[PDB]
Amino acid sequence: FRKMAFPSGKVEGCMVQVTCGTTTLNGLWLDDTVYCPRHVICTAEDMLNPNYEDLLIRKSNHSFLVQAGNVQLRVIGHSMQNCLLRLKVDTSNPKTPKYKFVRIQPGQTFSVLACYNGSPSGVYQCAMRPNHTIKGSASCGSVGFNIDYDCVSFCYMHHMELPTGVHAGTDLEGKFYGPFVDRQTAQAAGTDTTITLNVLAWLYAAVINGDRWFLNRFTTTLNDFNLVAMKYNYEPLTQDHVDILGPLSAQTGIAVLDMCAALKELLQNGMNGRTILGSTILEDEFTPFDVVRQC
Amino acid sequence: GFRKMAFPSGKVEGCMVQVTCGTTTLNGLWLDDTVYCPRHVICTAEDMLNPNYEDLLIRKSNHSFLVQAGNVQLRVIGHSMQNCLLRLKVDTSNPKTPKYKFVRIQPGQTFSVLACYNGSPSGVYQCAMRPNHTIKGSASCGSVGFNIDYDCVSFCYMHHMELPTGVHAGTDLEGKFYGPFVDRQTAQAAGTDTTITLNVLAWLYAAVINGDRWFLNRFTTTLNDFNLVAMKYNYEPLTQDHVDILGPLSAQTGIAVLDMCAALKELLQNGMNGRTILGSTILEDEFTPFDVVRQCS
Numbered sequence: 001f002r003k004m005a006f007p008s009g010k011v012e013g014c015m016v017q018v019t020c021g022t023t024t025l026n027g028l029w030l031d032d033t034v035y036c037p038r039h040v041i042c043t044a045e046d047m048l049n050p051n052y053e054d055l056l057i058r059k060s061n062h063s064f065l066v067q068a069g070n071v072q073l074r075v076i077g078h079s080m081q082n083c084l085l086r087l088k089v090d091t092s093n094p095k096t097p098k099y100k101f102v103r104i105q106p107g108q109t110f111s112v113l114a115c116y117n118g119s120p121s122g123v124y125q126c127a128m129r130p131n132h133t134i135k136g137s138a139s140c141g142s143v144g145f146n147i148d149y150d151c152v153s154f155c156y157m158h159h160m161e162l163p164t165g166v167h168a169g170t171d172l173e174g175k176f177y178g179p180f181v182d183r184q185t186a187q188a189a190g191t192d193t194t195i196t197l198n199v200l201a202w203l204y205a206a207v208i209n210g211d212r213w214f215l216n217r218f219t220t221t222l223n224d225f226n227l228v229a230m231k232y233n234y235e236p237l238t239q240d241h242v243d244i245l246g247p248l249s250a251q252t253g254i255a256v257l258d259m260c261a262a263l264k265e266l267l268q269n270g271m272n273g274r275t276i277l278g279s280t281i282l283e284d285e286f287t288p289f290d291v292v293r294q295c
Numbered sequence: 296g297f298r299k300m301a302f303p304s305g306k307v308e309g310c311m312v313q314v315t316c317g318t319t320t321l322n323g324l325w326l327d328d329t330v331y332c333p334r335h336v337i338c339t340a341e342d343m344l345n346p347n348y349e350d351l352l353i354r355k356s357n358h359s360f361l362v363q364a365g366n367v368q369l370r371v372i373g374h375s376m377q378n379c380l381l382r383l384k385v386d387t388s389n390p391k392t393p394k395y396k397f398v399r400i401q402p403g404q405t406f407s408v409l410a411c412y413n414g415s416p417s418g419v420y421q422c423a424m425r426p427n428h429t430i431k432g433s434a435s436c437g438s439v440g441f442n443i444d445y446d447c448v449s450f451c452y453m454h455h456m457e458l459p460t461g462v463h464a465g466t467d468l469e470g471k472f473y474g475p476f477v478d479r480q481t482a483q484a485a486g487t488d489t490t491i492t493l494n495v496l497a498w499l500y501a502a503v504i505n506g507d508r509w510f511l512n513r514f515t516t517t518l519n520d521f522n523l524v525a526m527k528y529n530y531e532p533l534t535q536d537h538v539d540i541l542g543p544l545s546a547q548t549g550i551a552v553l554d555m556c557a558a559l560k561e562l563l564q565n566g567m568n569g570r571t572i573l574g575s576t577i578l579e580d581e582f583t584p585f586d587v588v589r590q591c592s
Contacts, residue, residue: 002432004410004418009305114300122300122590123419135296135574137590138505165296165505209461278431278461280577294418294434 013095017118026141082174132178313414322437378470428474
């Protein structure tokens with residue numbers, strides 16, 4: 001049951017290079033606008049206590065250098081929206097796909113098109129951690145997206161690498177995910193818990209395929225499970241979660257709480273040599289939506 | 296954090312079509328005015344027990360082959376069989392054809408797969424070529440494997456058969472299978488799978504480069520003594536060629552190849568113990584020395 005990102009094609013044509021002063025980074029070119037982190041306007045010293053409005057007012061259109069492949073785009077306007085830079089260019093992207101800007105919940109998944117200086121380097125699948133970080137390659141301006149039907153739902157953009165080695169970022173409106181800001185400082189990251197809803201979905205996917213060895217005759221309640229789960233650093237399971245797993249429950253024939261009683265035993269005992277879907281560990285980067293879709 | 300990145304899939308996306316013959320429907324590769332697909336598209340469920348492909352192909356004409364490039368049907372103007380590949384010739388040449396080459400990769404080497412169903416891409420993933428000549432984790436037949444080399448696309452794989460264990464078997468783009476596998480429904484002997492040592496060692500060098508070096512030590516080992524332990528923990532034997540190939544990674548970190556073998560020895564024998572390498576509790580083996588240097592430079 002492979003990870004599998006989305007086909008990157010439609011996003012590839014939207015990836016541009018933005019340079020201001022001494023720093024280069026990636027930008028998202030949709031219609032006649034380029035989006036990128038606002039910290040591009042900042043130098044080394046600037047990033048310690050940046051005043052974004054002040055640093056921008058002494059910058060003109062000519063300061064920003066945009067390049068799409070080896071075509072240099074002409075930037076005729078510039079504005080700042082939250083933590084993003086909106087760069088108005090003279091041309092409308094001929095490769096603009098059907099697109100949406102969405103904000104996603106922690107635990108949800110998307111694909112990232114990792115780019116170096118505008119050129120697409122690689123595509124991978126990840127999940128927004130419960131602590132709002134993205135564990136990654138270490139970039140900047142690289143966007144995160146899902147593809148529904150013919151529409152691309154851009155939901156993420158990489159901004160900062162935190163002292164811990166994880167990556168923070170914003171949505172495509174400039175609002176950050178989690179308590180993070182765009183300045184070089186100490187930044188307090190929350191507990192990175194396991195996405196319980198995702199583990200169960202993955203365990204359901206195992207039942208659909210062949211692996212049924214972990215199922216048992218044990219029974220549990222919602223509170224009994226959480227009490228065992230939170231001991232092993234698992235995110236508390238809610239009634240909303242079990243409802244979300246409802247349609248997966250009907251297909252497999254295994255009631256959510258029985259699956260919880262299966263996970264409970266798995267956490268307490270470990271897997272003891274055995275594998276699930278060819279994996280030695282429990283996987284938590286597949287949503288219930290990912291499981292139904294990839295089966 | 297370290298990510299098993301697949302190559303961008305845009306260049307390959309515009310090459311994906313579906314082929315139909317009777318009831319059977321699968322994916323095909325449309326490059327220039329030729330379409331490549333698995334030859335078992337010309338087989339009914341019954342046929343797959345003992346398929347005489349020669350006797351079944353002569354039974355067909357262009358008429359019987361339907362090719363769909365998205366919402367567009369393509370009329371086929373000729374057909375032939377190259378090994379396990381069906382080769383249909385079409386009236387139009389694909390305008391979205393990228394600079395390409397066909398290659399036969401060696402076991403332990405990685406590539407990207409664009410999972411496709413009924414000619415439509417749904418996802419892309421990165422995998423290695425297992426020492427037992429299999430791959431795992433997709434979804435449909437006709438889906439291709441590839442590397443991206445700047446502007447050129449090197450196709451090296453195509454899915455043909457789904458083995459009973461879950462694993463997949465396929466051919467290169469000349470139609471030659473990888474391993475002893477065949478396009479027919481029978482036993483099909485998938486043997487011992489082994490960890491790719493060369494790939495793990497490159498991943499350990501990738502860990503040092505990023506800064507994570509807790510696993511290191513100063514107790515250098517012999518090639519013989521390492522290989523003895525490697526066999527017991529089900530790893531591929533390390534050869535002098537592997538040591539040569541791990542050259543640049545040894546030079547750049549300043550850690551000798553044999554010392555990293557001594558590091559891996561301890562990890563195999565003792566484990567990580569709650570500690571992680573690049574964010575993993577498992578030793579990864581789907582990153583070639585080439586992949587590491589690519590993402591680290």
